[PDB]
Design a protein around this ligand. Structure first.
Ligand SMILES: CN(C)C[C@@H](O)COc1ccc(Nc2ncc(Br)c(Nc3ccccc3)n2)cc1
Length: 283
């Protein structure tokens, strides 16, 4: 750490704090995350070879004094701040589509390598002046495990107690983020696990064996769950055109096995006219 000078605290990640910092030697500006099981070290090390233009580059891992520091490339701003800054007018559809397309590319890459994120949210989606958006904190959840942790983007199978979830959990989270960018309001803003689950049920309808075979046998499934009817997507995300709504619905399928994959999503008609606009960023 003697090689880094902290510039500012840019966030309180789930496991550890994140700082903007400068390399005292190279002068390089980076994002420094201060998080130790040997398994953790090895898992983190694999993440170092997981390089892709839509994944925040992990530059180095520093393990000193039973302490763990992760050095990442520094991005200009996070998606949450950009969304808040665009709340009055909303992010232009072309930019929303570009961002969704790039994130699906990033997920396709990670998923092809059997690595999933597990905790996607606006706060860990980072953007730059060039129009790129990248996934951060990727694979860390599987490595490690007083601000409240947001449940807004958690897939239903996780909420229902599935112990071995799949890459589908990331698609669900990205779908929730996609909706939020479009409507400028969180899709499922639950403040507890049951409230998160019921908010999902109230919108997509309480799941049953018809739409999700095996759901009634899930660890936390209760026959006593209220039975809400499903709502039309035209009501859930009005601004989104039919192509977008079709894609969103496949990203929010209850059954993880029926949920669209990142690779298949990339071939969806919605992206026929995708472009790469540049955002208006106030740094
Ligand atoms: C609204 N105000 C207070 C700003 C806040 O949203 C915060 O603004 C920023 C400004 C710049 C960055 N860059 C950044 N670059 C690389 C990484 Br790896 C990273 N990881 C990170 C992961 C989780 C939480 C916080 C950070 N962040 C991130 C957030």
């Amino acid at each position: 750490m003697e090689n880094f000078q902290k510039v500012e605290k840019i966030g309180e990640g789930t496991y550890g704090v994140v700082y903007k910092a400068r390399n005292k030697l190279t002068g390089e500006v980076v994002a420094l995350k201060k998080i130790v099981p040997s398994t953790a070290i090895r898992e983190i090390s694999l993440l170092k070879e997981l390089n892709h233009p839509n994944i925040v580059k992990l530059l180095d891992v520093i393990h000193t004094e039973n302490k763990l520091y992760l050095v990442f490339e520094f991005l200009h701003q996070d998606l949450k701040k950009f969304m808040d800054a665009s709340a009055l007018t909303g992010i232009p559809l072309p930019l929303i589509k570009s961002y969704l397309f790039q994130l699906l590319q990033g997920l396709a890459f990670c998923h092809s390598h059997r690595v999933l994120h597990r905790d996607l949210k606006p706060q860990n989606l980072l953007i730059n002046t060039e129009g790129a958006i990248k996934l951060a904190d990727f694979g860390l959840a599987r490595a490690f495990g007083h601000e409240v942790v947001t449940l807004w983007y958690r897939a239903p199978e996780i909420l229902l107690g599935c112990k071995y979830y799949s890459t589908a959990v990331d698609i669900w989270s990205l779908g929730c983020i996609f909706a939020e960018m479009v409507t400028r309001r969180a899709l499922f803003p639950g403040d507890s696990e049951i409230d998160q689950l019921f908010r999902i049920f109230r919108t997509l309808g309480t799941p049953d064996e018809v739409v999700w075979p095996g759901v009634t046998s899930m660890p936390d499934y209760k026959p006593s769950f209220p039975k809400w009817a499903r709502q039309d997507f035209s009501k859930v995300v009005p601004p989104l055109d039919e192509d977008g709504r079709s894609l969103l619905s496949q990203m929010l399928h209850y059954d993880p096995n029926k949920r669209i994959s990142a690779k298949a999503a990339l071939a969806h008609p919605f992206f026929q006219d995708v472009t790469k606009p540049v955002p208006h960023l106030r740094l």
